[PDB]
């Protein structure tokens with residue numbers, strides 16, 4: 060459903076998008092991220108260059124989320140990129156530095172900072188008055204993935220954020236986990252306009268050395284594969300016992316700290332691209348669009364007139380004062396049709412066509428990117444209407460994407476109707492016993508004919524009769540309903 064709106068002659072050219080999003084997804088995703096000047100392929104597999112058009116989106120995610128964790132008294136720090144083998148162990152996806160002259164003991168590039176920070180958490184934490192401790196850092200992470208890499212979704216090097224907190228009680232640590240999860244869900248929905256499902260991971264899908272793991276799950280209806288959006292781990296007293304992170308509570312006894320760890324990576328950018336894009340190229344939500352309004356004065360070869368420069372400057376002046384990020388494309392090198400497709404490929408929310416008739420009426424022609432809505436707005440109303448249009452743009456993207464996610468979830472009660480649903484490129488919600496043994500047989504049978512538990516949704520829309528309702532696989536007392544499907 061990415062081919063409904065009108066295409067121009069420039070959109071059907073090579074400077075547009077050639078592949079269809081549904082029938083040829085991988086080629087579509089490559090053309091969208093490359094022709095929009097977001098990604099540049101690197102001579103090292105799995106690594107990609109974040110060009111200014113895409114790095115702007117990551118900077119906005121930084122500004123919003125960093126300001127949210129500071130509301131909860133989370134402080135930023137920085138830990139070394141290297142780690143020793145003895146510390147890293149109390150494996151195949153860890154890059155090892157062995158030479159500089161070889162090294163007697165090779166050092167490793169951090170896949171995560173648990174083994175780096177917690178040896179010093181045990182040093183910094185001695186009393187209950189020293190808790191809670193909340194540390195975060197914005198850094199890059201290297202993980203040599205064995206599967207075929209995908210830009211943003213699965214890269215060997217990616218930018219991320221990792222928060223690590225320590226608490227005096229499990230209760231305080233758990234409500235810290237829910238806070239970061241709701242902020243993670245707020246990033247995808249309130250900022251990226253991408254719908255995600257808040258839930259709890261299964262025992263077989265949770266963080267390895269953790270206690271409880273909660274996450275948000277994203278899904279791509281076109282490819283029919285799920286994508287894990289972000290994770291928030293309740294580590295409990297597991298890691299504190301390994302590194303000796305114990306505090307002295309009131310009453311004098313010794314107790315191991317209750318820790319949490321949570322991360323969000325540049326995978327969020329890719330899930331957004333695949334959620335909103337169409338056959339013209341990028342479709343960006345206005346809250347992360349590098350340019351929300353592009354002003355295209357009708358001019359070819361000849362220089363821009365003094366009246367066109369006067370109109371385009373005051374329109375830019377009104378939008379700049381109104382908080383809208385706007386640029387003027389007065390390049391006489393390309394035709395107006397060329398500029399339309401150019402800024403549509405890179406997902407500019409609105410374009411302003413400024414012709415001689417628009418200067419006479421003191422209005423501008425506005426064309427909306429996602430739905431090709433056309434309208435005349437007087438200049439006297441730009442300060443008010445254009446912020447509203449960008450608000451309507453953001454709301455429309457989230458609404459249309461959310462009704463595609465609900466459309467991609469099918470309720471199943473018996474394993475006989477499970478396979479037919481998955482090939483429809485849809486997820487499965489089913490009653491499940493949440494046992495590790497049951498999940499191991501589900502992934503084996505689904506692969507022979509593989510789907511895994513995506514998350515146990517926090518919001519249970521379907522009721523389970525106590526004692527009677529049985530698992531959708533084999534036979535056991537089902538606890539509640541769990542979301543399944545194949546991943547990316």
Ligand SMILES: Nc1ncnc2c1ncn2[C@@H]1O[C@H](COP(=O)(O)O)[C@@H](O)[C@H]1O
Pocket residue numbers: 202204211212213214215217287288289290322323324325326
């Ligand atoms: N190669 C990768 N590129 C981008 N993000 C990743 C990559 N590998 C893992 N992540 C994300 O990093 C977090 C780590 O969680 P996990 O996948 O359980 O290790 C999750 O939010 C993943 O989606």
Ligand code: PRO
Pocket residue numbers: 171172220221222290292320321322323
């Ligand atoms: O690797 C992970 O998934 C967790 C979350 C960030 C820190 N460690």
Ligand SMILES: [Zn+2]
Pocket residue numbers: 491492493494497530531532533534535
């Ligand atoms: Zn079962």
